[PDB]
Amino acid sequence: ALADISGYLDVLDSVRGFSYLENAREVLRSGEARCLGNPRSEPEYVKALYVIGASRIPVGDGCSHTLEELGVFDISVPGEMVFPSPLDFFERGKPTPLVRSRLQLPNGVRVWLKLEWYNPFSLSVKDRPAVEIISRLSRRVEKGSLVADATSSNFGVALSAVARLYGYRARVYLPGAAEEFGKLLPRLLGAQVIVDPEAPSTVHLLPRVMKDSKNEGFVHVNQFYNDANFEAHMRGTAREIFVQSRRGGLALRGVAGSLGTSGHMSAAAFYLQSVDPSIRAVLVQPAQGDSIPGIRRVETGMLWINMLDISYTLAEVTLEEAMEAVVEVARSDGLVIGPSGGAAVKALAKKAAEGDLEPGDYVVVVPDTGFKYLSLVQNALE
Numbered sequence: 001a002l003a004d005i006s007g008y009l010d011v012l013d014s015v016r017g018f019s020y021l022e023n024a025r026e027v028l029r030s031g032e033a034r035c036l037g038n039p040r041s042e043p044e045y046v047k048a049l050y051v052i053g054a055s056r057i058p059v060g061d062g063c064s065h066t067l068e069e070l071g072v073f074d075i076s077v078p079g080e081m082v083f084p085s086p087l088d089f090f091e092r093g094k095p096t097p098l099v100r101s102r103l104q105l106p107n108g109v110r111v112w113l114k115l116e117w118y119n120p121f122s123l124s125v126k127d128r129p130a131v132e133i134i135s136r137l138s139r140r141v142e143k144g145s146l147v148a149d150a151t152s153s154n155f156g157v158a159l160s161a162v163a164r165l166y167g168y169r170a171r172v173y174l175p176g177a178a179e180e181f182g183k184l185l186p187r188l189l190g191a192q193v194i195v196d197p198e199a200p201s202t203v204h205l206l207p208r209v210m211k212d213s214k215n216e217g218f219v220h221v222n223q224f225y226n227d228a229n230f231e232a233h234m235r236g237t238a239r240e241i242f243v244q245s246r247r248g249g250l251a252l253r254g255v256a257g258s259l260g261t262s263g264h265m266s267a268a269a270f271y272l273q274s275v276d277p278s279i280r281a282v283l284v285q286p287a288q289g290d291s292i293p294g295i296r297r298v299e300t301g302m303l304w305i306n307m308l309d310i311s312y313t314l315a316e317v318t319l320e321e322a323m324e325a326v327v328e329v330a331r332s333d334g335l336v337i338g339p340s341g342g343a344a345v346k347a348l349a350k351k352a353a354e355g356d357l358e359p360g361d362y363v364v365v366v367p368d369t370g371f372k373y374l375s376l377v378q379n380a381l382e
Ligand SMILES: C=C(/N=C/c1c(COP(=O)(O)O)cnc(C)c1O)C(=O)O
Pocket: 124, 125, 126, 150, 151, 152, 153, 154, 155, 156, 202, 258, 259, 260, 261, 262, 263, 264, 265, 293, 294, 295, 338, 340, 341, 367, 368
């Protein structure tokens, strides 16, 4: 029949590698999953179902079940929006909103904005990998232990709140150019903060964090390499775009977004392209010389967007163009989005103007709120 997946999640601690994603892709492509005789004997298939958002798995001898039958489309949110704890609110208070913009783009490209600031700890998309990452730790790593990572600002905040709710201590490392909220808010939340005014980037800090890890023995959760980041976005962000698009009546032709770790947009593109491989992924390339907070250029070794069978198209965006999009979204929708969000809107507008996109509905993932970036806002005004 069906069994509750929550009983089988130790496969998250034992499955390794990307091969399980073949099952994920096929179940999503076909719209259904085959019965697992002994579910414990097919740990890859079980992880595949978890990662696409199933809450139930098919077991025993018997027939295949559809995505809907596996819970992929179940409603989690209580309609009255009352929650017994902050973590329960994070988990069941989903999806994040998907809102049609009044901003007009060329060639029949209709914009919808997915507002990831609607996450309770960091007011950003980074809550999701923080929760998934800390959760995966929490029965191999003893309480009281120190966990740490490098961050542009958002993950550090998320990691600080979530580490403490799970009984861990945290430390976050930031580059000198990070926003003030990233430097300060983790201390509010009880974490240690190290700012390296030398470091020109978040990734530039990773050798130092690794070395301190070896010396001091804290757990480096490494969001740039930890697959729980990608997994969080498969079951959360990406599934939601899929479910929201079907249930909302959208003619989904593409998603648009930005890349730091590449975690959220790799998941969105991977998930959606499993269901329909023509769905586009338009991704921001910050123009050379420019810094758009939280994000960076593909070249390098970002993990998932390169290693996974993902189709995408890049558009160059300058910081000035990104902030101009912030301005225009604000004046069109009354919504105040962050620079990376503006950059994504602009990348979609550019591809739309070139004639490269089928008319239809396009989802832009807006990683956070522009309230956090006042000095960039001021510059953009003049
Ligand atoms: C790497 C981080 N942030 C990613 C981020 C991103 C990129 O998201 P992914 O790491 O999932 O690629 C986009 N926009 C903003 C405002 C962000 O903070 C961090 O907060 O450490």
